[PDB]
Amino acid sequence: KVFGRCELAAAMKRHGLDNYRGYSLGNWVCAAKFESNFNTQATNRNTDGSTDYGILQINSRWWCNDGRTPGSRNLCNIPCSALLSSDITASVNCAKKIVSDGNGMNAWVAWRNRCKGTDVQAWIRGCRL
Ligand SMILES: [Cl-]
Ligand SMILES: [Cl-]
Ligand SMILES: [Cl-]
Ligand SMILES: [Cl-]
Ligand code: NA
Ligand code: NA
């Protein structure tokens, strides 16, 4: 599923991401934008052999099981395929664990490089939330 901007903001809010660990909803939408362009089916292979899955490009090195990432963990206790669903629940629940891991949203390199310090509120501007 490719979400609309305000559509995703609404879903993220409904699943409790809005201000989760102090990160406003706009931070989350911005991260999703640059990670997956709002496409739940987005996958990308990493140089180390791990793969990133879903709207927030969650990495199989730590967070999910895909059966093909040697020496990895599955800290979210989910198959990486769950992160590709039209229903964002699994992505949100996993992202809450990731953002709690110590480095906050810096876990998402793209958030650091493209969202951090910017006017993230622009990402939810105009949305009925
Ligand atoms: Cl957009
Ligand atoms: Cl915001
Ligand atoms: Cl594996
Ligand atoms: Cl933080
Ligand atoms: Na699509
Ligand atoms: Na914070």
Ligand code: NA
């Ligand atoms: Na993609």
Ligand code: NA
């Ligand atoms: Na894909």
Ligand code: NA
């Ligand atoms: Na992989």
Ligand code: NA
């Ligand atoms: Na994801």
Ligand code: NA
């Ligand atoms: Na997803």
Ligand code: NA
């Ligand atoms: Na695994």
